[PDB]
């Protein structure tokens, strides 16, 4: 009921505006009579997660190899705020 009324936004092939009052039975049915059942059931992405946990060469692995691999070449930090080195820093170049 949450997935149909809230997230789903309701029935699609039905009458979007019309509610027609019929002859014999005294009733405004074509909104009430549907009781929506459109489309697939409530899928939200849990069979995916448990399926990658369910279904499975690293059995023989030291943690230093798995937990410490080579990181990518582009994740390296840019040093935005660093004293520029083109002008040499103040250093006691008198060796005394």
């Amino acid at each position: 009921t949450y997935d149909d009324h809230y997230n789903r936004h309701n029935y699609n092939p039905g009458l979007p505006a019309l509610r027609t009052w019929n002859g014999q039975k005294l009733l405004w049915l074509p909104e009430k009579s549907d009781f929506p059942l459109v489309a697939p059931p409530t899928n939200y992405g849990l069979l995916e997660q448990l399926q990658q946990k369910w279904l499975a060469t690293s059995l023989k692995e030291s943690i230093y190899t798995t937990s410490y691999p080579r990181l990518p070449v582009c994740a390296m930090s840019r040093r935005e705020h660093a004293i520029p080195v083109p002008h040499p820093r103040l250093q006691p170049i008198p060796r005394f």
Binding site: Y2, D3, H5, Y6, N7, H9, N10, W28, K32, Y44
Partner: protein, 430 residues
């Protein structure tokens, strides 16, 4: 910077707060993601990447309806810790509600309240949504009005609570827990609004023509009374209200604080264009006994203090020329201590319809939050049922076995003695 943090608690509060916090998504530019593609700040707070996160607390002890909010598309808008989940219920009892199970999820609520109000620079009160007849809202809310009236003290508090239905009832032990949650609210609250579950099935059959409606067919109707009560902070207008304008103009006395709600324009989509919605008829809808949201007649009793929260084309002239004929008639009675009687508030925004709703687009909406002495009849039928099973001591053994005694039985009846003693003395004329 005039924020409001509102509390929904229980099985009802997540059923209502799913359909109460859906207008606040819809009438601002708020996606159910949380994004916008500044009146929203009373319910939505900026983050450093455009994301709006709300400021309400939803509590239920059984996690069986809260996890439905976590399934759908109402998840990224809400905050992960802002929704408190236990593992078991309280199972239609006040002892599990107030003593045992209410004592472990009570210190996880108050982390978030004390983090909410310490970012709210303009909070003016509290708004509560709890069930008299369940296990959580009877008890977990009953602890909070004991617990929040010592921490934050003198702040305003109001509740739109779900009263038991008068002729039909669902769970049988309710004339215990409905009486038992009453000695803990008359001195720890300020304005107790009541709505009914059966009394709106009548409304959707005679005003709307929809037979056999759902809770979510009754959740959006009560969900628009709420948007006509926050309708003063939220928008602009001629004369504006706040949470201290309500009870200073509605509750007279310390212990009679039980008003009654009524919402005027209820009509289908198709039948609206064949009928004239003048301001005379909209103010002559809430004074009919077939429009009240409880099953009571005001013809027995006497009005004491009223209210009117208009929207849209108020045109104060023709409103003033419409209250002036209500004062004429002898069918509508009052008590001589209130010769003024009324209140008018105004907002400019006409109300907004949801997709797939059952009401139409109406340009003029009226809520009438008035108190009457004819709730004192309605208390008695909920108070007649008590000694009809205390005499046999019918269901009493569920209560001693979770901390309470039989003395809470002996006084909660005696509190209803002097409450209904008070209403007979205020309903008498000078």
């Amino acid at each position: 910077m005039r924020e409001c943090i509102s509390i929904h608690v229980g099985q009802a509060g997540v059923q209502i707060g799913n359909a109460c916090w859906e207008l606040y998504c819809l009438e601002h530019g708020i996606q159910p993601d949380g994004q916008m593609p500044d009146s929203f700040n009373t319910f939505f707070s900026e983050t450093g990447a455009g994301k709006h996160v709300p400021r309400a607390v939803f509590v239920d002890l059984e996690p069986t309806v809260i996890d439905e909010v976590r399934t759908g598309t109402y998840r990224q808008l809400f905050h992960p810790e802002q929704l408190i989940t236990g593992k078991e219920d309280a199972a239609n009892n006040y002892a599990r509600g107030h003593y045992t199970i209410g004592k472990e999820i009570i210190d996880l609520v108050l982390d978030r309240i004390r983090k909410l109000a310490d970012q709210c620079t303009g909070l003016q009160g509290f708004l509560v949504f709890h069930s008299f007849g369940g296990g959580t809202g009877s008890g977990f809310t009953s602890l909070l009005m004991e617990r929040l009236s010592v921490d934050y003290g003198k702040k305003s508090k109001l509740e739109f609570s779900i009263y038991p239905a008068p002729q039909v009832s669902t769970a049988v032990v309710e004339p215990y827990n409905s009486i038992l949650t009453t000695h803990t609210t008359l001195e720890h609250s300020d304005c107790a609004f009541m709505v009914d579950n059966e009394a709106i099935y009548d409304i959707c059959r005679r005003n709307l023509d929809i037979e056999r409606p759902t809770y979510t067919n009754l959740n959006r109707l009560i969900g628009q009374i709420v948007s006509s009560i926050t309708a003063s902070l939220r928008f602009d207008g001629a004369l504006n209200v706040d949470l201290t304008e309500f009870q200073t103009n509605l509750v007279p006395y310390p212990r009679i604080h039980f008003p009654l709600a009524t919402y005027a324009p209820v009509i289908s989509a198709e039948k609206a264009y064949h009928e004239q919605l003048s301001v005379a008829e909209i103010t002559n809808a809430c004074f009919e006994p077939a429009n009240q949201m409880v099953k009571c007649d005001p013809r027995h009793g006497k009005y004491m203090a009223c209210c009117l929260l208009y929207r849209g084309d108020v045109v104060p002239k023709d409103v003033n020329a419409a209250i002036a004929t209500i004062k004429t008639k002898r069918t509508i009675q009052f008590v001589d201590w209130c010769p003024t009687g009324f209140k008018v508030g105004i907002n400019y925004q006409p109300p907004t319809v949801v997709p797939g709703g059952d009401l139409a687009k109406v340009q003029r909406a009226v809520c009438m939050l008035s108190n009457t002495t004819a709730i004192a009849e309605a208390w008695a039928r909920l108070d007649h049922k008590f000694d009809l099973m205390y005499a046999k001591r019918a269901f009493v053994h569920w209560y001693v076995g979770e901390g309470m005694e039989e003395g809470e039985f002996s006084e909660a009846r005696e509190d209803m003695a002097a409450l209904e003693k008070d209403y007979e003395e205020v309903g008498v004329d000078s």
